[PDB]
Design an enzyme around this catalytic site. Sequence first.
Site, short mmCIF file in Angstrom:
data_model
loop_
_atom_site.label_atom_id
_atom_site.label_comp_id
_atom_site.label_asym_id
_atom_site.label_seq_id
_atom_site.Cartn_x
_atom_site.Cartn_y
_atom_site.Cartn_z
N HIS A 24 18.03 6.80 -4.64
CA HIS A 24 17.24 7.23 -3.50
C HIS A 24 17.62 6.52 -2.19
O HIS A 24 17.41 7.03 -1.11
CB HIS A 24 15.77 7.02 -3.86
CG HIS A 24 15.42 7.56 -5.22
ND1 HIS A 24 15.38 8.92 -5.51
CD2 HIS A 24 15.14 6.93 -6.38
CE1 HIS A 24 15.05 9.08 -6.77
NE2 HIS A 24 14.92 7.89 -7.33
N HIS A 35 15.72 -2.11 2.11
CA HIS A 35 16.49 -0.87 1.93
C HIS A 35 16.39 -0.08 3.21
O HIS A 35 15.69 -0.44 4.11
CB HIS A 35 15.90 -0.06 0.74
CG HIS A 35 14.51 0.36 0.96
ND1 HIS A 35 13.42 -0.41 0.58
CD2 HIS A 35 14.00 1.45 1.57
CE1 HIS A 35 12.32 0.19 0.97
NE2 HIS A 35 12.65 1.32 1.57
N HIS A 55 16.45 4.09 5.15
CA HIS A 55 16.37 5.57 5.14
C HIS A 55 17.21 6.04 6.32
O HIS A 55 17.17 5.41 7.37
CB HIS A 55 14.93 6.02 5.32
CG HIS A 55 13.99 5.44 4.29
ND1 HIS A 55 13.71 6.05 3.08
CD2 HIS A 55 13.31 4.27 4.28
CE1 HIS A 55 12.84 5.30 2.41
NE2 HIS A 55 12.64 4.17 3.08
N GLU A 71 11.67 7.36 9.13
CA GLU A 71 10.41 7.83 8.47
C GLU A 71 9.30 7.83 9.48
O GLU A 71 8.72 8.88 9.79
CB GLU A 71 10.15 6.97 7.24
CG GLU A 71 11.24 7.13 6.22
CD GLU A 71 10.77 6.89 4.82
OE1 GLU A 71 10.19 5.81 4.59
OE2 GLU A 71 11.00 7.77 3.95
N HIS A 83 13.48 -1.04 5.93
CA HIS A 83 12.22 -1.52 5.36
C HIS A 83 12.42 -2.82 4.60
O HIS A 83 13.20 -2.84 3.64
CB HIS A 83 11.68 -0.47 4.39
CG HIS A 83 11.18 0.73 5.10
ND1 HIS A 83 10.94 1.95 4.48
CD2 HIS A 83 10.85 0.90 6.39
CE1 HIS A 83 10.49 2.80 5.37
NE2 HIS A 83 10.43 2.20 6.53
N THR A 99 6.39 5.01 0.82
CA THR A 99 6.94 6.31 1.29
C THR A 99 7.75 7.04 0.25
O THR A 99 8.22 8.14 0.48
CB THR A 99 7.75 6.21 2.57
OG1 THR A 99 8.99 5.63 2.25
CG2 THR A 99 6.96 5.52 3.68
N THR A 100 7.94 6.43 -0.93
CA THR A 100 8.53 7.05 -2.10
C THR A 100 7.53 6.99 -3.26
O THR A 100 6.64 6.09 -3.29
CB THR A 100 9.82 6.34 -2.56
OG1 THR A 100 9.52 4.94 -2.77
CG2 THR A 100 10.87 6.46 -1.51
ZN LIG Z 1 11.42 2.61 2.56
#
Ligand SMILES: [Zn+2]
Length: 257
Positions: free
Chosen positions: A61, A91, A93, A103, A116, A195-196
């Site tokens: 992801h 990590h 996005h 995000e 994040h 958020t996941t």
């Molecule tokens: Zn995140």
Amino acid sequence: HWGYGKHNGPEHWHKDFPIAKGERQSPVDIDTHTAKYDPSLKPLSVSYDQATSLRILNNGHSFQVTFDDSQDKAVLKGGPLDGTYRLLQFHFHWGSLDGQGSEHTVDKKKYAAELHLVHWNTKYGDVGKAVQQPDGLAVLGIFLKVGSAKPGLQKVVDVLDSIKTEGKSADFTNFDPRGLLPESLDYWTYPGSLTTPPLAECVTWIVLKEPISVSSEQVLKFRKLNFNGEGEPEELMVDNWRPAQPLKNRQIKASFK
Ligand SMILES: [Zn+2]
């Protein structure tokens, strides 16, 4: 199995994780004119001098850098938080193009990526227990824009070829996350969620106002990662961002005027 595509992406997640339609979901749009300055908010305390990075991992992801969280070595305190929160991992996005990837959004503006840094409240002892608590996690979010290179990101960029596909990891010791921080620690904060999946409503969000700049060459390397495992059809790891969710009954507070 969840993802970011047409058939398994964010609009599908509620079927396996019904909290996806809950009262405190993340990310959100940050309406800068509506966020209220809160003079009682403290400066954030980011204490990363003794951080111990361990591994870098493609989890299918995103990619993540993991830290030793068995002692108080890299901790977040202050700001809106009560207590001490240990850094577990960071990590990112990002998008297929520079006009999307973040995000959170700011007055509907999307950044090219979002970092994040995930921390858990030591009063709960471990991260698994912390995700079951409304004040279990604190995630520090940092926007990335494309322009000048971020030197402190380069060590990360340069190893991504060794973790191209899902399940690959590498040693990643002696990485200093202080090199990913902007000058200012001015922030917005609100109560939200992961958020996941599992989308747990356990997060105090701390989103920094100042983006970091990264170069086009740095973000291009993120876009060469693969969502797929080795041997499966190649599907670029891009657009691994959840869109803004309804704010509902929440107030976003600003640390700054
Ligand atoms: Zn995140």
